Amino acid sequence: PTETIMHANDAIQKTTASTRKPRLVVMVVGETARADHASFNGYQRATFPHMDKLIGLGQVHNFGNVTSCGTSTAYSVPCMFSYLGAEKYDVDTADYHENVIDTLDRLGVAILWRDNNSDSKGVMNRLPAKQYQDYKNSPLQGGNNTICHTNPYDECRDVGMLVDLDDHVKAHANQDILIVLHQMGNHGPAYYKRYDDEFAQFLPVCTSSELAECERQTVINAYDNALLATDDFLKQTIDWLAAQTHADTAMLYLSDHGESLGEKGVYLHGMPKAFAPKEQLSIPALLWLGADTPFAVANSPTAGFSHDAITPTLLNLFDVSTQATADKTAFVNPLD
Ligand SMILES: [Zn+2]
């Protein structure tokens, strides 16, 4: 209790940014997006038009139906960055452990967490305050997001987290960089507020929080429109990374959990993972790698990928060697 449980005391970077090309990784933490409403997973609608074309051109890898560790934000987000797998993870004691962010920051990787969701759910607690930035509010309301007044709800948009991101990179031009963007995404129940008018293409839309009152299709339409906005956001995120040429880049996207959309009377999420509908545990996962990338996409295990692959992935992306993630399954193979 009075001091933290360590996992990566043996963590060593095999190569550092002073002996090789620096690495710049953006980790997008999604929200409520589920795998089967992704067009690149066989969904009848084109919910991810930009990603669909990048996948069909071989720019982005799709990891299929990935399993989340849990069915809520408060549960999953700490576990996504944990050294403990979903089966040994305890949400009530997550703060007692060092996480992969702690490790990376300790080894000298420049961490920046921008949040248009809620907060980092404890993950960022040991790091200096300035490394966590609130993007849920405009500055007047004490935030940092300059893209809020684009809609009648004055809700801050995810694309606002991409503004002035160059300044952080220029500040740490000599070292490895990890930027976590915590997305508002498909947060319900008011899906119709999650996207600007630009993406209101699936009509008509349920413009109410009473999801069980609306006809199911109108709720789905809103949900799918919010996916469109996320797809666009990921596209602009990839475009930004592609503009960074003096570094090896990577964009990793995973939703924190899926969503029930009226299946057998179940709405929203948060159902206990033991008997939760599989929709709440089914999430999309995408990887984008920059030009002349040193990294390789890992083979898919027969059981499929899960949230447990994130921490070994982030470590492999920064050449970190530790017995906390020796033989574990990652999205990206470990480099020599
Ligand atoms: Zn969530």
Side-chain angles (χ1 to χ4, degrees):
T2 57
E3 250 190 322
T4 81
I5 301 174
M6 303 293 293
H7 297 274
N9 282 325
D10 60 334
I12 297 294
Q13 264 187 323
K14 312 191 209 70
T15 65
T16 63
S18 56
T19 60
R20 51 138 169 95
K21 187 175 294 216
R23 300 175 177 178
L24 170 63
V25 175
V26 173
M27 166 82 192
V28 181
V29 177
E31 243 295 337
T32 299
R34 83 187 198 187
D36 71 359
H37 274 243
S39 54
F40 49 77
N41 287 329
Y43 191 53
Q44 236 63 249
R45 281 176 164 179
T47 45
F48 284 84
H50 291 289
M51 297 304 107
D52 276 10
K53 100 145 188 203
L54 287 189
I55 296 175
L57 294 177
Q59 317 304 140
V60 171
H61 186 88
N62 174 31
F63 292 108
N65 185 23
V66 177
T67 307
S68 66
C69 59
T71 66
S72 72
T73 321
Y75 185 99
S76 294
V77 171
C79 180
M80 292 171 66
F81 298 94
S82 176
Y83 279 110
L84 277 57
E87 293 180 300
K88 284 195 243 287
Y89 165 78
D90 183 25
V91 61
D92 297 330
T93 56
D95 298 341
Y96 294 150
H97 305 266
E98 91 165 312
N99 55 46
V100 67
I101 294 292
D102 294 320
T103 309
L104 289 171
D105 172 72
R106 184 164 45 80
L107 297 187
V109 184
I111 312 293
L112 178 66
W113 186 297
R114 291 185 167 187
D115 202 289
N116 190 26
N117 185 90
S118 55
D119 53 271
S120 73
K121 304 297 185 182
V123 168
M124 213 70 178
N125 284 5
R126 289 186 192 87
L127 276 70
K130 65 185 179 183
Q131 303 192 36
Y132 173 90
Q133 294 176 354
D134 179 28
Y135 274 76
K136 302 189 301 293
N137 302 96
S138 74
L140 229 90
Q141 306 303 320
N144 297 284
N145 205 323
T146 54
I147 308 183
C148 296
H149 309 275
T150 61
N151 55 91
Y153 321 102
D154 284 292
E155 177 170 314
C156 297
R157 299 312 191 189
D158 296 323
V159 282
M161 294 188 293
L162 301 176
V163 182
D164 290 335
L165 207 50
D166 285 345
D167 295 298
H168 191 265
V169 173
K170 292 163 57 183
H172 305 94
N174 295 131
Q175 45 197 274
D176 292 336
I177 305 179
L178 171 61
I179 302 173
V180 178
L181 305 178
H182 192 185
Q183 212 191 166
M184 173 62 67
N186 276 49
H187 189 68
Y191 304 119
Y192 72 102
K193 297 186 189 181
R194 302 296 94 93
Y195 57 88
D196 288 328
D197 294 337
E198 181 182 7
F199 308 100
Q201 304 187 12
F202 299 111
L203 305 178
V205 165
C206 181
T207 60
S208 181
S209 297
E210 319 291 337
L211 303 186
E213 183 178 2
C214 302
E215 182 213 50
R216 280 196 53 182
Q217 185 60 42
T218 65
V219 181
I220 293 179
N221 290 3
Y223 184 89
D224 292 345
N225 288 334
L227 289 182
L228 286 175
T230 289
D231 171 78
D232 177 87
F233 166 69
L234 294 180
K235 187 59 171 62
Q236 297 195 44
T237 295
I238 287 181
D239 287 347
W240 178 82
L241 276 173
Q244 318 296 323
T245 47
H246 281 91
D248 288 319
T249 55
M251 199 278 290
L252 184 60
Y253 167 78
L254 295 92
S255 183
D256 60 339
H257 57 72
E259 186 86 324
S260 295
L261 293 176
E263 290 84 27
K264 307 171 190 175
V266 186
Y267 291 88
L268 299 182
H269 53 275
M271 198 152 310
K273 54 182 298 181
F275 57 85
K278 284 18 164 185
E279 300 280 16
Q280 299 187 14
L281 291 157
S282 164
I283 60 177
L286 299 177
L287 171 66
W288 177 90
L289 293 178
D292 300 320
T293 182
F295 308 109
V297 164
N299 293 330
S300 57
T302 44
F305 283 101
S306 71
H307 267 176
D308 296 342
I310 292 180
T311 292
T313 298
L314 292 178
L315 289 182
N316 290 343
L317 277 169
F318 293 105
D319 264 351
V320 178
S321 177
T322 175
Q323 294 307 307
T325 58
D327 296 299
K328 292 139 211 45
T329 298
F331 289 118
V332 166
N333 287 342
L335 296 187
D336 163 43

